Design a protein around this nucleic acid. Structure first.
Lengths: 65, 99, 82, 22, 88, 213, 149
RNA sequence: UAAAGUUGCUGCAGUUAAAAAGCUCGUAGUUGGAUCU
RNA sequence: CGCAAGACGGACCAGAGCGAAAGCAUUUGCCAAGAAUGUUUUCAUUAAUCAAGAACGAAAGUCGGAGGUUCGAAGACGAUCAGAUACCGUCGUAGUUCCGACCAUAAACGAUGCCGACCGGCGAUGCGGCGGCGUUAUUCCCAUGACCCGCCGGGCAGCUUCCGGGAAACCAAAGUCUUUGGGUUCCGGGGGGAGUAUGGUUGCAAAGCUGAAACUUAAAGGAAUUGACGGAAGGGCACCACC
């Protein structure tokens, strides 16, 4: 069915917005490597981020076979 | 015409592979071309588990298993339906069936 | 990808290559001046040495041959040249 | 006829000819 | 070797692992190393001892196989034989 | 950006990108996406260079703007993650949306009911939207794509390097594209933040829909 | 690829572009020449002399310090060996293989390797005869070649 | 004779249509890296 | 429970390794050999391919000697069958095992000559080397192993791809081919006759290498497609199927 009223209903339902954006947060955890990326991007002076420590090891591959 | 890239065996990088005898017919088939099944079986069947467990002299005996490796030739493996023919595209799939 | 070009730096893509396959080939080895704490003079040792070299004033094993780079003994301070 | 059996037949023919031709 | 008073007195003759136990350890992506020694105790009991070991997959291993190189296997076999001889 | 202070990256944009995790790629790296990454992390995640992301977004916005009839640009999303974002982008910029299943032959079968002839194509993911990508190679249709680290670049003419797996990232990417297209056209202005905010473009689960009301 | 093997190895030395004497190296050309003379008198082949000078004395390349190659220096001083060291080592390997094959007659692999070694010997000897390094009547015979070793 | 690029120097083929020696070594033959105004 | 003999070396064992191929799997020792890697070592064109010539060459087979467990051509018997001379069963000779001579052939296959250059991507794996968080063992420093993450070089392969090719199957070579020329060896020319005859040569023999013609014939053949059929597999349906 391709009725116009269904499109109107869908577009009204999708027209939802909160008062606070989900991207509006005080603390953003950022890894040191992306911090270096920001610093080389002329954005190392931003105080909105927070140091999250890197992972202990490099165990990210799933076991083979 | 060639049906399989590996010719239905795993012989890559060597000339000769020692043969083994099929457990079903005693046919000489190469160890890489032979079709291998490793069965782990309870030595007591599911129906007989209750009787043997009740008649045991110990408590929680956990019955021993049986580890048998069967090597099949292609003919006996096909007749026994261990493996079966597949479509030309499904043939290339080496992923074992779920278990 | 745009070889021998200064616009995109590639020290890291050049010393990663095989030594013979570089734009201009160059060894991956070096000579190193070694001090032994018990000794008092320089010894210039090849990094991939194949000889069990001894101190020129003593009888101490400076390094041992391995498959690749030679293995130096403990305490001997080694510094690359050039 | 299988090729190897025809080859065997030809071998037997040659042997018989060698025997007869002394 | 003796029977006294309707009692048979036994003595050590040998030792083995059960068939299921030894079949259960032989898995297909590891090396199994076997050694054997003919060694005599201080009482004169000559014993043939067979030792078996298997290479262990590390807890963070991604590699499927845990094979030992031939010299590593020879060193392990040497250690096994030496320890068996020392203990007997 | 063209080395223009008016078109350069802002602090708010970088903060939004970091909050949405747009810089976070996958553990795999397509060899044609190498120039858009910064470095691999210790856990295998590739970091996407946000300056390159901004450059490619602005180039895509320029490509979209240089089409006078806005309905001649098609914005596609087969995945559920980008359907809402694509619909909002189409409403904002006047482009034509294809959210949901893209039936094959839409660009090639002139008899079909839904037959349309776009002048530009934008997709949410080359992998998921491979059908419109392949069809674009039949009607001389250039393509703009939101490409992750492991996205294939075949039939993609302008790739925007970004995280296209997360709902926040996809919504924010479409929101920035719409904002920049509108800014370049003449509508709205760069002297003040846009009234719309990215959460409207986001995809939300029905459970979250129920919870947040 | 290898002359007598299916190997396609690439491993070899990679000379640096600069042909100058290293700054660290303080040995005069004559000092390197006397060290070469001493090592030759010790009973070493030019390859061994070069290896020792590289490993211990820091002489990266003798040709770059003295302007001459080690074999040429040994010849000019008059203490170069009778036959070239590569041919000498090939003959030594052939002698070792023949000694092994005398007491191991069922080793067909050894016979095949001996054939390869003697083919290499003959090729090198023909090249040397072309360069007048060996006398034109020189021939490798496997009856008393152990004396040549 | 051309057609026959079905005798292929120009200019053919040789996994499955006819076809690469079981495999190496090896003399002749053939072919041979840069470099000197 | 012992003793003896002759074979064989399971599981581990893999699209893993080594070898020129054939081929190679219990421990340990001796003997000589070898690839790759490392190398700011040495020689300095010594090279590639190869008529002649030569080494090796599965199995079966031949001669002589030793041995002879198992299996087993031939053969005997029992079955099945219209018949079976075969499949199946019980035996069983040569042989299968080893030593010394012979033979030189296999679907000896990747049905794909060797050497060199260039032309995509990805994840693995084997060896060597290089670099690096962190985890374990040496119950102590460094090192060295076992892991983990990468890089480089050869290697066995795999997946993928509108590189390109091809009749296609399919092949990162079987590509860089009418936009045709990097070097070189062997070799094919419609199907049969026929790898036959004959000659030569090799062999104890069996036979191996070389190798026709008369004559006959319009196709034989390759790849793929659709059907039909299958004593091939997997499904579905009708109380003219069953329960």
């Amino acid at each position: 069915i391709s009725i116009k009223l269904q499109e109107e209903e869908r577009e009204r339902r999708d027209n939802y917005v909160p008062e606070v954006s989900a991207l509006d947060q005080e603390i953003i955890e950022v890894d040191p490597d992306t911090k270096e990326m920001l610093k080389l991007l002329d954005f190392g002076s931003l105080s909105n981020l927070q140091v999250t420590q890197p992972t202990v090891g490099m165990n990210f591959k799933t076991p083979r076979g | 015409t060639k049906k399989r890239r590996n010719n239905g065996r795993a012989k890559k990088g060597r000339g000769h592979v020692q043969p083994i005898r099929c457990t079903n017919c005693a046919r000489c088939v190469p160890k890489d071309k032979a079709i291998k099944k490793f069965v782990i079986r309870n030595i007591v069947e599911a129906a007989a588990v209750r009787d043997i467990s009740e008649a045991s002299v110990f408590d929680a005996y956990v019955l021993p298993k049986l580890y048998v490796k069967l090597h099949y030739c292609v003919s006996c493996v096909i007749h026994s339906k261990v493996v079966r023919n597949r479509s030309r595209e499904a043939r290339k799939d080496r992923t074992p069936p779920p278990r | 990808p745009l070889a021998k070009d200064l616009l995109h730096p590639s020290p890291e893509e050049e010393k990663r290559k095989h030594k013979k396959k570089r734009l201009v080939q160059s060894p991956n080895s070096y000579f190193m001046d070694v001090k032994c704490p018990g000794c008092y003079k320089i010894t210039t040792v090849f990094s991939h040495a194949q000889t069990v070299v001894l101190c020129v004033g003593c009888s101490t094993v400076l390094c041992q041959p391995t498959g690749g780079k030679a293995r130096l003994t403990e305490g001997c301070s080694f510094r690359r040249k050039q | 006829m299988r090729a190897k059996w025809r080859k065997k037949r030809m071998r037997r023919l040659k042997r018989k000819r060698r025997k007869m031709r002394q | 070797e003796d029977v006294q008073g309707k009692n048979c007195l036994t003595n050590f003759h040998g030792m083995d692992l059960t068939r299921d136990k030894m079949c259960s350890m032989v898995k297909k992506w590891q090396t199994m190393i076997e050694a054997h020694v003919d060694v005599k105790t201080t009482d004169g009991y000559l014993l043939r001892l067979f030792c078996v070991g298997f290479t262990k997959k590390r807890n963070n291993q991604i590699r499927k196989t845990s094979y030992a190189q031939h010299q590593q296997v020879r060193q392990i076999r040497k250690k096994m034989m030496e320890i068996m001889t020392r203990e007997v | 950006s063209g080395a223009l202070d008016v078109l350069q990256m802002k602090e708010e944009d970088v903060l939004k990108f970091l909050a949405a995790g747009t810089h976070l790629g996958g553990t795999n790296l397509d060899f044609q996406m190498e120039q858009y990454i910064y470095k691999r992390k210790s856990d295998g995640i590739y970091i996407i260079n946000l300056k390159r992301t901004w450059e490619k977004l602005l180039l895509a916005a320029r490509a979209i703007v240089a089409i006078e009839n806005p309905a001649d640009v098609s914005v596609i999303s087969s995945r559920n993650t980008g359907q809402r974002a694509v619909l909002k982008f189409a409403a904002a910029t006047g482009a034509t949306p294809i959210a949901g299943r893209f039936t094959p032959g839409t660009f090639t079968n002139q008899i079909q009911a839904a037959f349309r002839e776009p002048r530009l194509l934008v997709v949410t993911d080359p992998r998921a939207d491979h059908q419109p990508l392949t069809e674009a190679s039949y009607v001389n249709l250039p393509t703009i794509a939101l490409c992750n680290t492991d996205s294939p670049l075949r039939y993609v003419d302008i790739a925007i390097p970004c995280n296209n797996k997360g709902a926040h990232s996809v919504g924010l990417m479409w929101w920035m594209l719409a904002r920049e297209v509108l800014r370049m056209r003449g509508t709205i202005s760069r002297e003040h933040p846009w009234e719309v905010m990215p959460d409207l473009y986001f995809y939300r689960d029905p459970e979250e829909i129920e919870k947040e009301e | 690829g290898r002359m007598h093997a299916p190997g396609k190895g690439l491993s070899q030395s990679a000379l640096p572009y600069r042909r100058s004497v290293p700054t660290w190296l303080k040995l005069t050309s004559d000092d390197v020449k006397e060290q070469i003379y001493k090592l030759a008198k010790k009973g070493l082949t030019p390859s061994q002399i070069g290896v020792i000078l590289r490993d211990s004395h820091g002489v990266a390349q003798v040709r770059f310090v003295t302007g001459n190659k080690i074999l040429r220096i040994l010849k000019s001083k008059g203490l170069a060996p009778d036959l070239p060291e590569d041919l000498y080592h090939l003959i030594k390997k052939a002698v070792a293989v023949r000694k092994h094959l005398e007491r191991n007659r069922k080793d067909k692999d050894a016979k095949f390797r001996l054939i390869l070694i003697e083919s290499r010997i003959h090729r090198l000897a023909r090249y040397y005869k072309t360069k007048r390094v060996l006398p034109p009547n020189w021939k490798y015979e496997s009856s008393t070649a152990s004396a040549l070793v």
